[PDB]
Amino acid sequence: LYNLAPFFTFKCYGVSPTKLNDLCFTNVYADSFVIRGDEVRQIAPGQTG
Amino acid sequence: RDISTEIYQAGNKPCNGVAGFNCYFPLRSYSFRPTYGVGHQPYRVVVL
């Protein structure tokens, strides 16, 4: 998925960007939904609305 | 000692001019809030 083409919005805060395969986790939780393209920026924590 | 503040990218060429999960601004700010404990309080560090 790192080299996949049609990924458009790629913005996260959590871990090291390219070192994510070098530190090891315990459990991974995947949350899936559908939202309008206008307020994709709103998904980041910190703001309101 | 390095002072350059160019956009960090370890293999991500198109990051020039934009940010993302794979590319950030290389710098980040310390909070040093009074409510923060000894585990996060500002420590004067001098390496001799």
UniProtKB/Swiss-Prot annotation, chain B:
Result of changing F25L: Increased resistance to neutralizing antibodies and human covalescent sera neutralization
Region spans: Disordered: 1-25
Cysteine-cysteine disulfides: C15-C23
Phenotype for A10V: Increased resistance to neutralizing antibodies
Protein function: Attaches the virion to the cell membrane by interacting with host receptor, initiating the infection. The major receptor is host ACE2. When S2/S2' has been cleaved, binding to the receptor triggers direct fusion at the cell membrane. When S2/S2' has not been cleaved, binding to the receptor results in internalization of the virus by endocytosis using host TFRC and GRM2 and leading to fusion of the virion membrane with the host endosomal membrane. Alternatively, may use NRP1/NRP2 and integrin as entry receptors.
Subunit structure: Binds to host ACE2. RBD also interacts with the N-linked glycan on 'Asn-90' of ACE2. Cleavage of S generates a polybasic C-terminal sequence on S1 that binds to host Neuropilin-1 (NRP1) and Neuropilin-2 (NRP2) receptors. Interacts with host integrin alpha-5/beta-1 (ITGA5:ITGB1) and with ACE2 in complex with integrin alpha-5/beta-1 (ITGA5:ITGB1). May interact via cytoplasmic c-terminus with M protein. May interact (via N-terminus) with host bilirubin and biliverdin, thereby preventing antibody binding to the SARS-CoV-2 spike NTD via an allosteric mechanism.
Protein name: Spike protein S1
The species this protein was found in: Severe acute respiratory syndrome coronavirus 2
Included stretch of the parent chain: 466 to 513 of 1273
